Amino acid sequence: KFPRVKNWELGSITYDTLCAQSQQDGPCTPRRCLGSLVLPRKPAEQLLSQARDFINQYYSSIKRSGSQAHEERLQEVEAEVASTGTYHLRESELVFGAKQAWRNAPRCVGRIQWGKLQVFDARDCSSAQEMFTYICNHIKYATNRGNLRSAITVFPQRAPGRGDFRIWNSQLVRYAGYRQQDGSVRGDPANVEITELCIQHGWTPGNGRFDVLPLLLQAPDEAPELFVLPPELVLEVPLEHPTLEWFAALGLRWYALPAVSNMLLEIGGLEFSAAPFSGWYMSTEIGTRNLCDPHRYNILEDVAVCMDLDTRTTSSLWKDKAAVEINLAVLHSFQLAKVTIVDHHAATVSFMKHLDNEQKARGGCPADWAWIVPPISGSLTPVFHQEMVNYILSPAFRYQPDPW
Amino acid sequence: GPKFPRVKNWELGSITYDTLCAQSQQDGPCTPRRCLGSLVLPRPAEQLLSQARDFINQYYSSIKRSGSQAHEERLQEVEAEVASTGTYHLRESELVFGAKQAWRNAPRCVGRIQWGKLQVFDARDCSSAQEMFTYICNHIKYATNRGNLRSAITVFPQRAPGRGDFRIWNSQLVRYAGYRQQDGSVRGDPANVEITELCIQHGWTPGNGRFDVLPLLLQAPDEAPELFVLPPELVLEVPLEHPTLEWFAALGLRWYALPAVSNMLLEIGGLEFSAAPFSGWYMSTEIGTRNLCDPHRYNILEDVAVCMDLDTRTTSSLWKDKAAVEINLAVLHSFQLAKVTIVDHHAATVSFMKHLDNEQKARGGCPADWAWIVPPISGSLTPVFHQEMVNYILSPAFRYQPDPW
Ligand code: HEM
Ligand code: HEM
Ligand SMILES: Cc1cc(N)nc(COC[C@@H]2C[C@@H](OCc3cc(C)cc(N)n3)CN2)c1
Ligand SMILES: Cc1cc(N)nc(COC[C@@H]2C[C@@H](OCc3cc(C)cc(N)n3)CN2)c1
Ligand SMILES: C[C@H](O)[C@H](O)[C@H]1CNc2nc(N)[nH]c(=O)c2N1
Ligand SMILES: C[C@H](O)[C@H](O)[C@H]1CNc2nc(N)[nH]c(=O)c2N1
Ligand SMILES: [Zn+2]
């Protein structure tokens, strides 16, 4: 019933009682574990239950649980669903759901910050045009000249009649990927499809490796519309190396703001199909995955040749050496440009602190080991040695289909 | 789609479905409500017979004589034997087959491309702790082969009704002492603190180095275990040096050549081999990253970063990453120089991808534990980081088993 959970470095044991609050099945069965899969294979009575449970969550969180205001709020929601099929959240309830969805996210190592989230209410949005204004204000706020501040902006919820509000881009800042005659890619290979969708809805493309993409924003049942982000709003960091001089000449750079924009926010049964959120980068996201993945910018080889390493054989560990400097370069450059970054040691240490905090607060913390453990130097970080239970709690961020 | 797990590689964009998982006869620890895949250890006449029949079925499949007269006579032979004894016995070639299949089935092993090349020593005639020792010594000699390492397993008698087990108390054939100090620290390998203390309690005269090879504690049925010292010439060790950091040799770090797991249970067709030590060759990250750099193992990262002159006061210098890479290069360099088989985490994972593809064609999938397959340094620099994996238990298997004491 309740899983024993051991840290292998310290020999300490806890018991997860929180997982008993899960009400959504993940992918695993007793016959086989599917925990390393990235995606899943994927009614008034049931909306009422999710809503009840979430309002309960809310009033508990403000300690007014059971009181008059709590009863009256449960009545409003019920009366509203029975009549209309749906309901709406109060701004304060929303703010709480957003924080909580972040707190519940098993794949996020940055959760120590969960209580500090600026929530922009954009539920009074009726056009791609308005979406764009809200998106620009979010970016300005979040960026704050390099002093990054966590933020979410919440667009109008999904409804029975109509199409969704959608940001088509997976992130608010993305570099173009250009498919070439010879089938190779200029720019970021991850963004091939979105680059092409932009061109098709009328974008004049560049030809660089680091061209910031426009936004395709979709108001309900309408064609998506194209919006260019003003260049001065997209803070970028040119990459250099503390001791390696040539490195700067590789012309590498990355943007400051990691802002997820294709994920669905679910609160109390209500669904928010456009609810972009941002914090700040952990350097291994840029240094290791975005620049070193073979199906990304794939720069290892370039770098190692520049370092004059023996590229001929795996056992010289040239890949491990190059990766280490590229990560160092990212940290150096962000520090130099006074933009917020966290290294993977600092981040995982504070994740451990968060795990402890959550054990005392809620009796557990849903966590996805494969995603929490950094993509270089796993066992050198404390999370490697930590056993973790993965389950789904609501409020949640979920994946959702692409709108095309 | 088919109703079998869809499995994706996010580097190459390629897709497969694991149908082999259908053959699983045993529940792991996960449920629809929570995944427990990161946990290291999560918590009879008719049962035996049906496990047996299934294994015999596998054997006869594997020789392409499935449904034959020799198949139905073997089945009949097996049930007769249980009917009159409560147990049964494997033919020689059956044990060979099932030992290989147990390796083949091991979700945590990245070295499985090698699974068809296992020397199987049959030691089911063994009858004393002294004889266990001779067998083990022969195993080590053969497996070691002056540094040209060869995979091997030695199989001692299976569990019997009421009669006591054969047990190797040590967790590996080669293990370094861990001495608990008066200041509360540990000299040597802290992983081996309990076994060192049991060795002394059973009459071993301990040393006081960081790298004292432990003696073997060997248990024959219903007997207290007996102590045997390995002759130093049988235990091949590699002194560690670095190709360019001249001072690294001065640290006096060393590791042994032969990784030989001695405390796991080999289960075949319901039969349980409580002593069945097996060995291969190391992947370099086991030594240089885990055994040397784990904070609860040798913990040498700081010391090495100091020697390298790194800024150890700030996480953001990546001093931990830089030192681990060098310790890892030193392991590879030194094994190479000493002509002792070893494989780096790149070569190994590449070959595990080849193995996945072979197994896809051969069996329709491959049970694999992603957290153990991905190496503990440079994870996403290896092709297996990007490969989804399905984890499940197939038999024959190696399982963990309660410590004999
Ligand atoms: C405050 C600084 C933060 C840091 C350092 C951080 C760190 C990370 C990292 C490293 C990942 C894995 C990313 C990847 O591999 O692509 C991640 C995932 C995630 N984070 Fe954060 N995070 C932060 C803030 C936030 C915020 C503000 C939210 C939402 C309000 C959030 C929600 C999520 C979610 C839902 C995922 C899973 C994404 C997915 O499934 O693709 N994080 N976080
Ligand atoms: C041929 C060279 C081999 C290599 C490079 C290799 C590689 C590995 C590695 C790196 C591990 C993880 C070790 C750890 O983190 O504790 C492992 C685990 C394992 N291997 Fe191998 N292996 C090899 C041969 C073998 C052989 C010959 C067998 C048995 C016949 C075997 C069976 C196992 C089992 C059962 C595990 C899991 C052990 C556990 O859960 O503690 N491997 N293998
Ligand atoms: C808030 C935040 C902070 C921070 N430091 N980093 C992030 C990174 O965002 C995570 C994104 C979400 C994931 O993308 C969604 C996705 C899923 C799948 C299956 C495919 C695909 N192309 N894209 C992969 N990385 C987000
Ligand atoms: C055969 C082989 C080759 C190779 N390159 N590497 C290996 C590594 O062996 C795996 C080790 C031994 C295992 O010990 C398991 C164990 C230990 C203890 C103290 C108790 C227990 N129940 N089970 C875990 N990791 C084995
Ligand atoms: C296939 C595997 O699950 C996939 O590569 C995962 C592994 N761990 C990850 N971890 C993080 N943080 N982000 C990722 O994109 C991935 N990818
Ligand atoms: C908690 C976690 O499961 C544990 O640290 C695992 C992670 N992956 C591993 N992988 C291997 N190969 N060996 C190990 O000992 C571990 N330890
Ligand atoms: Zn699972």
PDB file of C-alpha atoms in Angstrom, chain A residues 272-401:
ATOM      1  CA  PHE A 272      -6.477  25.650 -19.709  1.00  0.00           C
ATOM      2  CA  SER A 273      -5.043  24.883 -23.171  1.00  0.00           C
ATOM      3  CA  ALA A 274      -2.876  27.990 -23.271  1.00  0.00           C
ATOM      4  CA  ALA A 275      -1.115  28.668 -19.993  1.00  0.00           C
ATOM      5  CA  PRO A 276       2.560  29.417 -20.756  1.00  0.00           C
ATOM      6  CA  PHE A 277       4.930  29.236 -17.808  1.00  0.00           C
ATOM      7  CA  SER A 278       8.553  30.122 -17.237  1.00  0.00           C
ATOM      8  CA  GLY A 279      11.278  29.971 -14.568  1.00  0.00           C
ATOM      9  CA  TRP A 280      15.017  30.028 -15.336  1.00  0.00           C
ATOM     10  CA  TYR A 281      17.374  27.514 -16.986  1.00  0.00           C
ATOM     11  CA  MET A 282      19.503  24.832 -15.413  1.00  0.00           C
ATOM     12  CA  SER A 283      22.699  24.896 -17.375  1.00  0.00           C
ATOM     13  CA  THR A 284      22.597  21.205 -18.461  1.00  0.00           C
ATOM     14  CA  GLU A 285      19.467  21.978 -20.490  1.00  0.00           C
ATOM     15  CA  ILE A 286      21.466  24.288 -22.736  1.00  0.00           C
ATOM     16  CA  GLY A 287      24.995  22.933 -22.258  1.00  0.00           C
ATOM     17  CA  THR A 288      24.275  19.218 -22.632  1.00  0.00           C
ATOM     18  CA  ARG A 289      20.843  18.596 -24.269  1.00  0.00           C
ATOM     19  CA  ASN A 290      20.273  21.619 -26.564  1.00  0.00           C
ATOM     20  CA  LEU A 291      23.872  21.928 -27.810  1.00  0.00           C
ATOM     21  CA  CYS A 292      25.171  18.358 -27.506  1.00  0.00           C
ATOM     22  CA  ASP A 293      22.209  16.060 -28.379  1.00  0.00           C
ATOM     23  CA  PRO A 294      22.877  14.480 -31.755  1.00  0.00           C
ATOM     24  CA  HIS A 295      19.466  15.463 -33.058  1.00  0.00           C
ATOM     25  CA  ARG A 296      19.933  18.984 -31.679  1.00  0.00           C
ATOM     26  CA  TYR A 297      22.773  21.419 -32.473  1.00  0.00           C
ATOM     27  CA  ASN A 298      25.107  18.406 -32.117  1.00  0.00           C
ATOM     28  CA  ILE A 299      28.294  20.503 -31.385  1.00  0.00           C
ATOM     29  CA  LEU A 300      30.461  18.009 -29.474  1.00  0.00           C
ATOM     30  CA  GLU A 301      32.639  17.124 -32.457  1.00  0.00           C
ATOM     31  CA  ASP A 302      33.344  20.777 -33.389  1.00  0.00           C
ATOM     32  CA  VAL A 303      34.311  21.554 -29.828  1.00  0.00           C
ATOM     33  CA  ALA A 304      36.556  18.562 -29.359  1.00  0.00           C
ATOM     34  CA  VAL A 305      38.439  19.228 -32.550  1.00  0.00           C
ATOM     35  CA  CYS A 306      38.884  22.803 -31.283  1.00  0.00           C
ATOM     36  CA  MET A 307      40.237  21.345 -28.028  1.00  0.00           C
ATOM     37  CA  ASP A 308      42.432  19.169 -30.234  1.00  0.00           C
ATOM     38  CA  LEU A 309      41.251  15.943 -28.684  1.00  0.00           C
ATOM     39  CA  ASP A 310      41.630  12.469 -30.093  1.00  0.00           C
ATOM     40  CA  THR A 311      38.304  12.034 -31.900  1.00  0.00           C
ATOM     41  CA  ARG A 312      39.193   8.594 -33.310  1.00  0.00           C
ATOM     42  CA  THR A 313      38.201   6.490 -30.347  1.00  0.00           C
ATOM     43  CA  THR A 314      35.567   6.599 -27.637  1.00  0.00           C
ATOM     44  CA  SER A 315      38.032   5.651 -24.848  1.00  0.00           C
ATOM     45  CA  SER A 316      39.808   9.044 -24.839  1.00  0.00           C
ATOM     46  CA  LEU A 317      36.519  10.288 -23.418  1.00  0.00           C
ATOM     47  CA  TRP A 318      36.597  13.233 -25.830  1.00  0.00           C
ATOM     48  CA  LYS A 319      32.805  13.511 -25.684  1.00  0.00           C
ATOM     49  CA  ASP A 320      32.831  13.757 -21.892  1.00  0.00           C
ATOM     50  CA  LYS A 321      35.613  16.355 -22.003  1.00  0.00           C
ATOM     51  CA  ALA A 322      33.956  18.578 -24.608  1.00  0.00           C
ATOM     52  CA  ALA A 323      30.616  18.402 -22.881  1.00  0.00           C
ATOM     53  CA  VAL A 324      32.145  19.573 -19.610  1.00  0.00           C
ATOM     54  CA  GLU A 325      33.606  22.736 -21.160  1.00  0.00           C
ATOM     55  CA  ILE A 326      30.372  23.544 -23.052  1.00  0.00           C
ATOM     56  CA  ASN A 327      28.484  23.347 -19.781  1.00  0.00           C
ATOM     57  CA  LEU A 328      31.128  25.503 -18.137  1.00  0.00           C
ATOM     58  CA  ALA A 329      30.857  28.019 -20.992  1.00  0.00           C
ATOM     59  CA  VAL A 330      27.095  28.286 -20.490  1.00  0.00           C
ATOM     60  CA  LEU A 331      27.492  28.928 -16.776  1.00  0.00           C
ATOM     61  CA  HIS A 332      30.311  31.430 -17.300  1.00  0.00           C
ATOM     62  CA  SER A 333      28.418  33.380 -19.936  1.00  0.00           C
ATOM     63  CA  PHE A 334      25.146  33.576 -17.998  1.00  0.00           C
ATOM     64  CA  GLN A 335      27.064  34.730 -14.899  1.00  0.00           C
ATOM     65  CA  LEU A 336      28.988  37.313 -16.985  1.00  0.00           C
ATOM     66  CA  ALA A 337      25.792  38.675 -18.539  1.00  0.00           C
ATOM     67  CA  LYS A 338      24.102  38.692 -15.096  1.00  0.00           C
ATOM     68  CA  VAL A 339      21.271  36.442 -16.211  1.00  0.00           C
ATOM     69  CA  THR A 340      19.870  33.826 -13.848  1.00  0.00           C
ATOM     70  CA  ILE A 341      21.132  30.262 -14.255  1.00  0.00           C
ATOM     71  CA  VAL A 342      21.527  27.328 -11.899  1.00  0.00           C
ATOM     72  CA  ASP A 343      24.054  24.491 -12.305  1.00  0.00           C
ATOM     73  CA  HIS A 344      22.954  20.887 -11.903  1.00  0.00           C
ATOM     74  CA  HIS A 345      24.696  20.394  -8.545  1.00  0.00           C
ATOM     75  CA  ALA A 346      23.184  23.465  -6.984  1.00  0.00           C
ATOM     76  CA  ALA A 347      19.771  22.531  -8.433  1.00  0.00           C
ATOM     77  CA  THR A 348      19.714  18.896  -7.327  1.00  0.00           C
ATOM     78  CA  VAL A 349      20.917  19.774  -3.829  1.00  0.00           C
ATOM     79  CA  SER A 350      17.937  22.113  -3.466  1.00  0.00           C
ATOM     80  CA  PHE A 351      15.658  19.456  -4.947  1.00  0.00           C
ATOM     81  CA  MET A 352      16.796  17.196  -2.066  1.00  0.00           C
ATOM     82  CA  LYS A 353      15.825  20.007   0.344  1.00  0.00           C
ATOM     83  CA  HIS A 354      12.477  20.150  -1.399  1.00  0.00           C
ATOM     84  CA  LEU A 355      11.923  16.383  -1.000  1.00  0.00           C
ATOM     85  CA  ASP A 356      12.426  16.775   2.814  1.00  0.00           C
ATOM     86  CA  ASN A 357      10.099  19.798   2.941  1.00  0.00           C
ATOM     87  CA  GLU A 358       7.435  17.817   1.048  1.00  0.00           C
ATOM     88  CA  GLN A 359       7.728  14.732   3.298  1.00  0.00           C
ATOM     89  CA  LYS A 360       6.877  16.828   6.342  1.00  0.00           C
ATOM     90  CA  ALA A 361       4.246  18.852   4.482  1.00  0.00           C
ATOM     91  CA  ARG A 362       2.307  16.170   2.534  1.00  0.00           C
ATOM     92  CA  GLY A 363       3.894  12.736   3.254  1.00  0.00           C
ATOM     93  CA  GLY A 364       5.580  12.329  -0.122  1.00  0.00           C
ATOM     94  CA  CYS A 365       6.541  13.979  -3.430  1.00  0.00           C
ATOM     95  CA  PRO A 366       5.818  12.565  -6.901  1.00  0.00           C
ATOM     96  CA  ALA A 367       9.091  12.537  -8.821  1.00  0.00           C
ATOM     97  CA  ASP A 368      10.338  10.997 -12.068  1.00  0.00           C
ATOM     98  CA  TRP A 369      13.882   9.824 -11.540  1.00  0.00           C
ATOM     99  CA  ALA A 370      14.842   9.665 -15.235  1.00  0.00           C
ATOM    100  CA  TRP A 371      13.994  13.405 -15.577  1.00  0.00           C
ATOM    101  CA  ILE A 372      15.243  14.665 -12.224  1.00  0.00           C
ATOM    102  CA  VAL A 373      18.705  13.165 -12.665  1.00  0.00           C
ATOM    103  CA  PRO A 374      20.832  15.493 -14.779  1.00  0.00           C
ATOM    104  CA  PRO A 375      22.049  14.353 -18.194  1.00  0.00           C
ATOM    105  CA  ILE A 376      25.754  14.530 -17.275  1.00  0.00           C
ATOM    106  CA  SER A 377      27.310  13.458 -13.963  1.00  0.00           C
ATOM    107  CA  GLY A 378      24.214  11.687 -12.692  1.00  0.00           C
ATOM    108  CA  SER A 379      25.751   9.857  -9.765  1.00  0.00           C
ATOM    109  CA  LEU A 380      27.810  12.886  -8.812  1.00  0.00           C
ATOM    110  CA  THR A 381      24.514  14.514  -7.826  1.00  0.00           C
ATOM    111  CA  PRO A 382      22.518  13.493  -4.779  1.00  0.00           C
ATOM    112  CA  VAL A 383      19.310  12.766  -6.641  1.00  0.00           C
ATOM    113  CA  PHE A 384      20.899   9.699  -8.398  1.00  0.00           C
ATOM    114  CA  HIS A 385      21.117   8.017  -4.995  1.00  0.00           C
ATOM    115  CA  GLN A 386      17.584   8.859  -4.054  1.00  0.00           C
ATOM    116  CA  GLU A 387      14.646   6.557  -4.677  1.00  0.00           C
ATOM    117  CA  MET A 388      11.562   8.335  -6.067  1.00  0.00           C
ATOM    118  CA  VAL A 389       7.906   7.487  -6.517  1.00  0.00           C
ATOM    119  CA  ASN A 390       6.106   8.726  -9.558  1.00  0.00           C
ATOM    120  CA  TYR A 391       2.356   9.358  -9.655  1.00  0.00           C
ATOM    121  CA  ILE A 392      -0.185  11.878 -10.934  1.00  0.00           C
ATOM    122  CA  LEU A 393      -1.730  14.468  -8.604  1.00  0.00           C
ATOM    123  CA  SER A 394      -4.145  17.222  -9.606  1.00  0.00           C
ATOM    124  CA  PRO A 395      -3.794  20.266 -10.305  1.00  0.00           C
ATOM    125  CA  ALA A 396      -1.439  19.155 -13.055  1.00  0.00           C
ATOM    126  CA  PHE A 397       0.414  20.189 -16.159  1.00  0.00           C
ATOM    127  CA  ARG A 398      -0.320  17.708 -18.938  1.00  0.00           C
ATOM    128  CA  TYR A 399       0.736  17.149 -22.490  1.00  0.00           C
ATOM    129  CA  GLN A 400      -1.940  17.764 -25.120  1.00  0.00           C
ATOM    130  CA  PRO A 401      -2.217  17.138 -28.909  1.00  0.00           C
TER     131      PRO A 401
END
